């Protein structure tokens, strides 16, 4: 969970070579779904990021 | 705790750099952002670990076991 | 007598509207709403609906 009440669990795991990746190669640690944003109204999470 | 080995994101070895990053802030009086730059960590996934790791190991170490 | 007749007839709350949705039965845009949340905290408000072209009620999630 975050510091904003976004509790959740791990669905599955991936390695880097099929994790998505950005131009500098910063491969992310973890990906959460966008739909947890609007209905939860958790703006400060985004601001923190 | 020690510095981690091996940044979780990227994989570059970190841990050689720790005491260097310390003495960059002890006598060289240097700003820390430039300290990491001069240490040579230009991606930021690597940069977060040195900048946020806390060293509890010596606070452990000040006991007297055996 | 005029003041008495005015005081006889009572509450007339009037249901402020918008024009975005259409009626579930009449299918016209005179729609009025409300907000509050009913169920537990994990979900948003209820988005109550109240048509005024015919008086219909429905709801959106
Ligand atoms: Zn890294
Ligand atoms: Zn209607």
Curated annotation (Swiss-Prot), chain A:
<comment type="similarity">
    <text>Belongs to the RNA polymerase beta chain family.</text>
</comment>
<protein>
    <recommendedName>
        <fullName>DNA-directed RNA polymerase II subunit RPB2</fullName>
    </recommendedName>
</protein>
<comment type="subunit">
    <text>Component of the RNA polymerase II (Pol II) complex consisting of 12 subunits.</text>
</comment>
<comment type="function">
    <text>DNA-dependent RNA polymerase catalyzes the transcription of DNA into RNA using the four ribonucleoside triphosphates as substrates. Second largest component of RNA polymerases II which synthesizes mRNA precursors and many functional non-coding RNAs. Proposed to contribute to the polymerase catalytic activity and forms the polymerase active center together with the largest subunit. Pol II is the central component of the basal RNA polymerase II transcription machinery.</text>
</comment>
Swiss-Prot record, chain B:
<comment type="subunit">
    <text>Component of the RNA polymerase I (Pol I), RNA polymerase II (Pol II) and RNA polymerase III (Pol III) complexes. Component of the RNA polymerase I (Pol I) complex consisting of 14 subunits: RPA135, RPA190, RPC40, RPA14, RPB5, RPO26, RPA43, RPB8, RPA12, RPB10, RPC19, RPC10, RPA49 and RPA34. The complex is composed of a horseshoe-shaped core containing ten subunits (RPA135, RPA190, RPB5, RPO26, RPB8, RPB10, RPC10, RPA12, RPC19 and RPC40) where RPA135 and RPA190 form the DNA-binding cleft.</text>
</comment>
<dbReference type="InterPro" id="IPR020789">
    <property type="entry name" value="RNA_pol_suN_Zn-BS"/>
</dbReference>
<dbReference type="GO" id="GO:0006367">
    <property type="term" value="P:transcription initiation at RNA polymerase II promoter"/>
</dbReference>
<dbReference type="GO" id="GO:0006384">
    <property type="term" value="P:transcription initiation at RNA polymerase III promoter"/>
</dbReference>
<feature type="binding site">
    <location>
        <position position="45"/>
    </location>
    <ligand>
        <name>Zn(2+)</name>
    </ligand>
</feature>
<dbReference type="GO" id="GO:0001172">
    <property type="term" value="P:RNA-templated transcription"/>
</dbReference>
<comment type="similarity">
    <text>Belongs to the archaeal Rpo10/eukaryotic RPB10 RNA polymerase subunit family.</text>
</comment>
<dbReference type="GO" id="GO:0006383">
    <property type="term" value="P:transcription by RNA polymerase III"/>
</dbReference>
<comment type="function">
    <text>DNA-dependent RNA polymerases catalyze the transcription of DNA into RNA using the four ribonucleoside triphosphates as substrates. Common component of RNA polymerases I, II and III which synthesize ribosomal RNA precursors, mRNA precursors and many functional non-coding RNAs, and a small RNAs, such as 5S rRNA and tRNAs, respectively. Pol II is the central component of the basal RNA polymerase II transcription machinery. Pols are composed of mobile elements that move relative to each other. In Pol II, RBP10 is part of the core element with the central large cleft.</text>
</comment>
<dbReference type="GO" id="GO:0006368">
    <property type="term" value="P:transcription elongation by RNA polymerase II"/>
</dbReference>
<dbReference type="GO" id="GO:0006362">
    <property type="term" value="P:transcription elongation by RNA polymerase I"/>
</dbReference>
<feature type="binding site">
    <location>
        <position position="10"/>
    </location>
    <ligand>
        <name>Zn(2+)</name>
    </ligand>
</feature>
<feature type="binding site">
    <location>
        <position position="46"/>
    </location>
    <ligand>
        <name>Zn(2+)</name>
    </ligand>
</feature>
<dbReference type="GO" id="GO:0008270">
    <property type="term" value="F:zinc ion binding"/>
</dbReference>
<dbReference type="GO" id="GO:0003677">
    <property type="term" value="F:DNA binding"/>
</dbReference>
Swiss-Prot record, chain C:
<feature type="binding site">
    <location>
        <position position="26"/>
    </location>
    <ligand>
        <name>Zn(2+)</name>
    </ligand>
</feature>
<feature type="binding site">
    <location>
        <position position="23"/>
    </location>
    <ligand>
        <name>Zn(2+)</name>
    </ligand>
</feature>
<protein>
    <recommendedName>
        <fullName>Transcription elongation factor S-II</fullName>
    </recommendedName>
</protein>
<comment type="function">
    <text>Can promote the transfer of one strand of a double-stranded DNA molecule to a homologous single strand and thus may be involved in recombination.</text>
</comment>
<comment type="similarity">
    <text>Belongs to the TFS-II family.</text>
</comment>
<feature type="binding site">
    <location>
        <position position="54"/>
    </location>
    <ligand>
        <name>Zn(2+)</name>
    </ligand>
</feature>
<feature type="binding site">
    <location>
        <position position="51"/>
    </location>
    <ligand>
        <name>Zn(2+)</name>
    </ligand>
</feature>
<comment type="function">
    <text>Necessary for efficient RNA polymerase II transcription elongation past template-encoded arresting sites. The arresting sites in DNA have the property of trapping a certain fraction of elongating RNA polymerases that pass through, resulting in locked ternary complexes. Cleavage of the nascent transcript by S-II allows the resumption of elongation from the new 3'-terminus.</text>
</comment>
<feature type="zinc finger region" description="TFIIS-type">
    <location>
        <begin position="19"/>
        <end position="59"/>
    </location>
</feature>
